[PDB]
Amino acid sequence: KLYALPRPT
Amino acid sequence: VLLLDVTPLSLGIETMGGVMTTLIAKNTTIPTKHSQVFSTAEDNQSAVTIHVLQGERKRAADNKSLGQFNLDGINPAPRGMPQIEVTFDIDADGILHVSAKDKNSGKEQKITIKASSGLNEDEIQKMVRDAEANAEADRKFEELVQTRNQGDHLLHSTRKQVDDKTAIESALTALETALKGEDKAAIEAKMQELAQVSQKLME
Numbered sequence A: 001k002l003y004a005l006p007r008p009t
Numbered sequence B: 001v002l003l004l005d006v007t008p009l010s011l012g013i014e015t016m017g018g019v020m021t022t023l024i025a026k027n028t029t030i031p032t033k034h035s036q037v038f039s040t041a042e043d044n045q046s047a048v049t050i051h052v053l054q055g056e057r058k059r060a061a062d063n064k065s066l067g068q069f070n071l072d073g074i075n076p077a078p079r080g081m082p083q084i085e086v087t088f089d090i091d092a093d094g095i096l097h098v099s100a101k102d103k104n105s106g107k108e109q110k111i112t113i114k115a116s117s118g119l120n121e122d123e124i125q126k127m128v129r130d131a132e133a134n135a136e137a138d139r140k141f142e143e144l145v146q147t148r149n150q151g152d153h154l155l156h157s158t159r160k161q162v163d164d165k166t167a168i169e170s171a172l173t174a175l176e177t178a179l180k181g182e183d184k185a186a187i188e189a190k191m192q193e194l195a196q197v198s199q200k201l202m203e
Helices: B121-158 B164-175 B184-194
Strands: A003-005 B011-015 B019-024 B032-040 B048-054 B064-071 B084-090 B096-102 B108-113
Touching: A003 B011, A003 B048, B011 B084, B019 B032, B019 B084, B019 B121, B048 B096, B048 B108, B064 B096, B064 B108, B121 B164, B121 B184, B164 B184
Parallel strands: A003 B032
Antiparallel strands: B011 B019, B011 B048, B032 B084, B048 B064, B084 B096, B096 B108
């Protein structure tokens, strides 16, 4: 597996 | 030993859609060190946000925050391409050090969090009795965000493969207006449709 983040504020 | 020191709760980071994705399981013995590679949620993402969370519940917002920090400078690049190594270390003193590194740029940042932070006993009892209480509950938000994230990538990854158009665009707004929903099979249904006005761009 592999997970994604978001962009900051 | 009758006794031992453990980090009392799940600890991890937040990921796309607002789930908690953990790095170090509750009741894991410490010092314990863990690493997990993350990537980027949208294309040409230049910066990311590493948020440290304490608690067991699927929704980030429901877990205790310990801190956050940015990792900047990442090359703009297709989602999933950048390899972002996230590492948790809890040393002896229970001092918690998180660090995120861009394998590409080699840009790196770190946060140092205090032993005394997080949840307290009362809080940690309620976290858990809260957790399994909403078991089903949270396995639900799980597949939801799974699917939003999926339909989101499309919303995105379709929008640029394009009159079966006036139509695709239609879907696109049936998909967008569903992603925002808490009905999975809906979103996914709507996905299903896009899945079949768009063939004639694959054809």
